[PDB]
Amino acid sequence: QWTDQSFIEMMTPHHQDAIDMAEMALQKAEHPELKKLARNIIRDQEREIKEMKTWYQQWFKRPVPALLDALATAQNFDREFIRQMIPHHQMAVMMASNLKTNTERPEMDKLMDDIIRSQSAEIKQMKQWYQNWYG
Ligand SMILES: [Ag+]
Ligand SMILES: [Ag+]
Ligand SMILES: [Ag+]
Ligand SMILES: [Ag+]
Ligand SMILES: [Ag+]
Ligand SMILES: [Ag+]
Numbered sequence: 001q002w003t004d005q006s007f008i009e010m011m012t013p014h015h016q017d018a019i020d021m022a023e024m025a026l027q028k029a030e031h032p033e034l035k036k037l038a039r040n041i042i043r044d045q046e047r048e049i050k051e052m053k054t055w056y057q058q059w060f061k062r063p064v065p066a067l068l069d070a071l072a073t074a075q076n077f078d079r080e081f082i083r084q085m086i087p088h089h090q091m092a093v094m095m096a097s098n099l100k101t102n103t104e105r106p107e108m109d110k111l112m113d114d115i116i117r118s119q120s121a122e123i124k125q126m127k128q129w130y131q132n133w134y135g
Helices: 004-028 032-060 077-100 106-134
Strands: none
Touching: 004 032, 004 077, 032 077, 032 106, 077 106
16 A cells, blocks of 8 residues: 555656656657647646655655656657557556555645646547557
């Protein structure tokens, strides 16, 4: 079971990976649906990293401890982007749901709701797009 401290420690690099993937999409994605999704992921998840970073220092009096090829060389970026981003998002929703029943902090509770709602929604849309484009 996650604590607020451990959650931020794992979710931050996790969110940062989604952001980096999304950055590639801005250059490498062919579907405009994906570029839109990418800008959303970048905006929402960078905001959440900033919030988590800020809260971590207030609560724990120290900064957040600092702890490819299929996507890089790819000729079919849009396809492999979704293949990666779906289970990635599912992992975030899973971690957020876990913390949500353990946490006592109202700001963590609300952040979990955002992660769960926004990323579940992007999962639905990506599955539908995968079906339309590659089904
Ligand atoms: Ag994440
Ligand atoms: Ag990745
Ligand atoms: Ag790339
Ligand atoms: Ag993700
Ligand atoms: Ag995890
Ligand atoms: Ag298409």
